Amino acid sequence: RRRQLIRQLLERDKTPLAILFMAAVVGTLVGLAAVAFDKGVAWLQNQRMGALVHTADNYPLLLTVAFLCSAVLAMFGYFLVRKYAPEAGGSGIPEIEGALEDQRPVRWWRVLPVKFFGGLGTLGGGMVLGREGPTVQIGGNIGRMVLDIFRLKGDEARHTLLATGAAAGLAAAFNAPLAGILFIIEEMRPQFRYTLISIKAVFIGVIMSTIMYRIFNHEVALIDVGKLSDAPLNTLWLYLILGIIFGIFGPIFNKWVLGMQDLLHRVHGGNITKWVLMGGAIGGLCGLLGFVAPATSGGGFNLIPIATAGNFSMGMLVFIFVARVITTLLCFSSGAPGGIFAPMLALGTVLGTAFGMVAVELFPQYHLEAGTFAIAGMGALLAASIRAPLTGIILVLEMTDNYQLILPMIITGLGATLLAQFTGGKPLASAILARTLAKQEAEQ
Amino acid sequence: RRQLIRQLLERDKTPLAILFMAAVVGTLVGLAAVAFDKGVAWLQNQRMGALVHTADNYPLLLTVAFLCSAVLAMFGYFLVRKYAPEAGGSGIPEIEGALEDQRPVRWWRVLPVKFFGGLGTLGGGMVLGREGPTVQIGGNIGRMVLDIFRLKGDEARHTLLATGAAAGLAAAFNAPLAGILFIIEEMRPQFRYTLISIKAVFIGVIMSTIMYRIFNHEVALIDVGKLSDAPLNTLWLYLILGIIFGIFGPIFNKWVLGMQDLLHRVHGGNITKWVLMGGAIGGLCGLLGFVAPATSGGGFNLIPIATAGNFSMGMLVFIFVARVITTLLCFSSGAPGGIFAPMLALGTVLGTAFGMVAVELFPQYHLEAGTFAIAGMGALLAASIRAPLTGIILVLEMTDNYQLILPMIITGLGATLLAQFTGGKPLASAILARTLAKQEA
């Protein structure tokens, strides 16, 4: 076996020119798609807040059109899913994880038009879901499409172009190139066996999509928090405690999203009509809240800059948290097209700020800024529910651009993951695959 | 299928013993890396102190610089040749094999040999980084705790070996993420599935970083400041720079390989001619660490000066050519010390040079050469040792100019692409292939 290694070591990092070039056209297409999707969602949110002007005088009629606009767009979203692509439900990260494990089909001819227009509706109604869901999955199918159209053969190409699509997808959903690659080589990849994924090819994909996103999203970051204060060595232990808190909460949030899937599955019983109607009901509630208390609704990217700056009161933060938990569970667990990834960053910001505030009053000699705790805790929920800390930590580091908080973020992130394990918690994306995959067996 | 459902529910379940033993490795790796970094600085300080006491008479101090660095080099080359020949050169290739179970981890030997040996070569002011020492010493420390606590398994043996070498690189650059990404891009068994627990690596990296920060906070290894931004219509320049790194990447691989061979003739395997030649190179480095300090040493001191564009065009060319020579000599000769760091300094110099050319050709892009310096800095690392992802994140963690990420990624990729298309090979894998193929022949 030594002699084979010597043969292999000399042939290391040699990806076929066909794969590299195809990963390029994957990234390009994922980027354009994720740009179109992002622009479409922003237009629908714009039309929706355009009607609340035509009906700004009649408050009951205002609250009516706030519900009825989000409802009709959610219904349309839930429908296109239920009728044309059941796989295009929820996030889609667990679906593309199954595709990389060769246990799920990548029916692109179905998901591409559904997840795109379906998500457009649910996100456009301002439901509490992210773009990751749509863009990562859509990304994976775009990679599959160009594998099929160009009829590319072999384990490397099918795994690589499927991974680079997912990577380009996340990278366009957060303008975070590194995060897309780190997401693949920690979370997306088959976790128990070797895989022929070319990391170099993943890169090219991620690059092109990042470039495509930067062509149409120049000079506006998704999250501008500005350079926060530093973190002194004697402060570190406080981030470990923050970790532990996220660590016990990570598995509990997973039980709620899994249970709520089951609890809402009774309300419709897997019926197309009761689902679409429950779907519009949840959606409408978001558009209502997307006026009366917008912190509780929407993706979650807007309150992040606010909460870090310490502009919310301890009263308001607690309210935001609870109401966002409820709205995150109602949207994701319901099976709407959209990721739980972005709302999980928003939740961690809130809870992190709340801890930070309590930390500031308790420790004046540390000279704390509740915002450093807000950032450390931002990707901490991703590190305790999703169980991808090295994805979360870098995802944050790319959006907030506060490298000087690298240790506190790691310490919190790792604290999240350790207690997430020690309290018997399961990787949310794997846990969803292992339930859908188990449901594929149990009915035989 | 049913196998996977069983696996998924058991994903990320590291045995607490591994996790706790990970924490103990990083701590030991960190503190040792701290002590190594203190010793080398200590010995460098002494050499400057001896130059002060014989400050008059030019040929007198040029001799005491040579002899100070020669004596210390000799001490290193000897400690390696006499007790642990495996601890020569980098050590990164040695540990990679150790992860493939194709090499032994003789910690009882390597630890003191690499520590005190590196102290010699580094402290004398040779063109070698701290990684070599710390990475190897790192793995060996991770082996020590395996043996001492009698931990059983493939996982425990691979994991504690990996975290050690990760924590090693971590405390060598104050770059936690780079260490972790190094393990999962280059260090890990590249062709089969391994039982390396990422969670355990992390914990180890944390500890060594905390240990490094407890001594070296408030002063960074490279301060560059916040550079300008890079507009989109500029990105193509970073592709070209990457292409230049793409062709030079393998040509530098050839030389380091070939100069390993040519320097093997001068001693023929003889412990005495080796030591005396290694002292001659070491002496040359201390002598040059006075008459043109940017050609000798680790090269960390010149990066800031290079990036600021303080050197002229000529001064850069010289510094490059001279540093091509001095890097080979010290690494190729099998002196204990990494090529990792000297390659950063090569990348900056070449980058700044390209940027200086760029600045005058295109006054409309409002360029700052220093941006190309930062994009080129880890481009050599992306084209020689062929770990672009580790390379990019390493630069990002030391320079802190995240707004230059696209330039950094495009250059780094444009290197690894043209390094693949011109025959080149991962330098740390090629050296492993040499050491393994020379073993079964």
């Epitope: 120049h218 000079e219 | 916040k226 300008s228 507009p231 989109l232 219509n233 500029t234 564009g309 600045v359 006054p363 409309q364 892009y365 409002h366 700052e368």
Partner: antibody, heavy 120, light 107 residues
Framework: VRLLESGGGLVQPGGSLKLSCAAS????????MSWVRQAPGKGLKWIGE????????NYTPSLKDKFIISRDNAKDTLYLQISKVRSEDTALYYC??????????????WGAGTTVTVSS | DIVLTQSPAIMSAAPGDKVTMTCSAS?????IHWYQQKSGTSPKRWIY???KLTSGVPVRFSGSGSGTSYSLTINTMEAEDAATYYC?????????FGGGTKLEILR
Amino acid sequence: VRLLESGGGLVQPGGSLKLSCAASGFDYSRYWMSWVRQAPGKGLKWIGEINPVSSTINYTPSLKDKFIISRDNAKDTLYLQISKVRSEDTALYYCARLYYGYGYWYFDVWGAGTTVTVSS
Amino acid sequence: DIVLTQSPAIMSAAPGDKVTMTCSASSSVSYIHWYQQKSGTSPKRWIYDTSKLTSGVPVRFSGSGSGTSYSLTINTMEAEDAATYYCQQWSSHPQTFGGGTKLEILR
């Protein structure tokens, strides 16, 4: 954001005056600054630019020390020294903060202007 | 240095009219900018990169062109648009301005 250039007025032919533009409301570093002038009734002619670290200063096709563009990041101030002032230098002088979109630079925020009248 | 020439030097149209002015270049240019200078005020970055509108510029304004010909178009002009509109390129150093199109209003 506000640019308030001053120090102009009356100068004797062949003389020399120093214009100062005082900036506020934005980090004055990070930004390239520029000078643009407009002779009465006529259009815009670029004078010169300066980067934040003062390491690059480019001028329009002029002569010796005709224009000397400098800056003091400490005071948030841009300067323009005009030497051997002739009747063509009778104009309105704008300090303009420079920026770009896709990469081809524009004049982002313009100051009010100071008037220079060259006369005896 | 590229010589940009602005088509109408002075033009007059009544509100509601579609108005197109032109900035033509001696050599080839790309991503040219536009400036509005109303009487007695400093120029204001109006259109930039050929067709992007600065924040605050009403959507009645639009820009286009490529190579040598470029045009700023006001779709249904309004009386408050009475200004002088300078174009400017910086695709070739040094940057250079136009002569100006002085838009006048007919009421």
